[PDB]
Coordinates of C-alpha atoms in Angstrom, one line a residue:
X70 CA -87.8 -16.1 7.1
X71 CA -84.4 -14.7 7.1
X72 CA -81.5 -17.1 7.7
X73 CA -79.0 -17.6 10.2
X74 CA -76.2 -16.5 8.2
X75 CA -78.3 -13.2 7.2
X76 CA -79.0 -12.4 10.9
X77 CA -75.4 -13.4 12.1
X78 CA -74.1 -11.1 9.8
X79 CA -76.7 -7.6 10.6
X80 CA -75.5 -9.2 14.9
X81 CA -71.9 -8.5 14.2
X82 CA -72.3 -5.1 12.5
X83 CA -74.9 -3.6 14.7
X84 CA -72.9 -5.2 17.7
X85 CA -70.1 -3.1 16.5
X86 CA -72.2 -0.3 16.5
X87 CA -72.6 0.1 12.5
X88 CA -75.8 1.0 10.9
X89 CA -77.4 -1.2 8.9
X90 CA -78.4 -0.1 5.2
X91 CA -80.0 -2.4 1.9
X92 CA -80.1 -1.6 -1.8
X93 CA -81.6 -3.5 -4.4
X94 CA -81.3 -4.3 -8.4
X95 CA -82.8 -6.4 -10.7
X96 CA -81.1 -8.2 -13.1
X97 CA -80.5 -5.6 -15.9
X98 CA -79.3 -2.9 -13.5
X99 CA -77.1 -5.9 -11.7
X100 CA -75.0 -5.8 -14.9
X101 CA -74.0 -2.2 -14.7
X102 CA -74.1 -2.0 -11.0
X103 CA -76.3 0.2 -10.6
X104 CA -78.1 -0.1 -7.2
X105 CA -81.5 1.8 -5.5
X106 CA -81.7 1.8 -2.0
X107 CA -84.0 0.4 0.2
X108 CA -86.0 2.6 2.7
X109 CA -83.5 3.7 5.6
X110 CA -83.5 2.0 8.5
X111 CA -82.7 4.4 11.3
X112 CA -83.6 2.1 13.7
X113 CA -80.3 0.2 15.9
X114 CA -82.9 -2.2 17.6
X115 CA -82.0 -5.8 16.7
X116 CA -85.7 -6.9 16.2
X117 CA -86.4 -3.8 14.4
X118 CA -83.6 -3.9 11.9
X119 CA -84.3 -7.5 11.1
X120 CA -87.9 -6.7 10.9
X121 CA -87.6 -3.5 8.3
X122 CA -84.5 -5.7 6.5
X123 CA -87.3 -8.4 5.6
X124 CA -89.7 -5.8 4.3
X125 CA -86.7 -4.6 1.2
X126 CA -86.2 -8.2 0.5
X127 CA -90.1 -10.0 0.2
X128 CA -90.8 -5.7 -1.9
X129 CA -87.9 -7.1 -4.2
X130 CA -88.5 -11.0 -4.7
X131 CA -86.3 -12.1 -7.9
X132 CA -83.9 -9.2 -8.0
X133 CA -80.5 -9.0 -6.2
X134 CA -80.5 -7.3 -2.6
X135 CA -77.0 -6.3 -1.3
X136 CA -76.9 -5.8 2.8
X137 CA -74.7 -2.7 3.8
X138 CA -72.7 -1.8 7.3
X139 CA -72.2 2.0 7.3
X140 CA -70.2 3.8 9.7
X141 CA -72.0 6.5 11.0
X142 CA -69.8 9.3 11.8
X143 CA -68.1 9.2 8.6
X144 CA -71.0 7.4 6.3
X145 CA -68.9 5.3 4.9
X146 CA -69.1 1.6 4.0
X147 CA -67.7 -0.8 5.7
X148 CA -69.2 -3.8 4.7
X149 CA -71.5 -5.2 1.5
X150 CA -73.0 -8.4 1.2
X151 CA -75.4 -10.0 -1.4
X152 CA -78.2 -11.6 0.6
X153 CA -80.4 -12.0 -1.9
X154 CA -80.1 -13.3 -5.5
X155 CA -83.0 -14.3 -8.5
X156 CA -82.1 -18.0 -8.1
X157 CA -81.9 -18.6 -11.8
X158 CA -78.8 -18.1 -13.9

């Protein structure tokens, strides 16, 4: 389901040794940035990640769902990606 660009990208981060986050917004709370998360995914198994990453993307179909790489010692973010987009504009 996912594609290749999606699971290259949660590769390098978890490679790295990043945890993987998700936060999602439909298209009113898109304009003003305002984001909810995603259950976290504690989990640094590839096939897990991937597995629970799917789950916050099909429970949010048509909104926008941004992929997150999180440093864990400091909880910071060090990467954000959209993954997921309602394909109308």
């Amino acid at each position: 389901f996912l594609s290749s660009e999606v699971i290259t990208q949660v590769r390098s981060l978890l490679n790295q040794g990043y945890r993987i986050g998700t936060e999602h917004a439909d298209k009113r709370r898109f304009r003003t940035s305002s984001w909810q998360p995603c259950a976290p995914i504690q989990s640094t198994n590839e096939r897990q990640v991937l597995s629970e990453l799917e789950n916050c993307l099909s429970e949010h179909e048509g909104e926008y769902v941004r992929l997150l790489g999180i440093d864990t010692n400091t909880r910071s973010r060090v990467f954000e990606a959209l993954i997921q987009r309602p394909d109308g504009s």
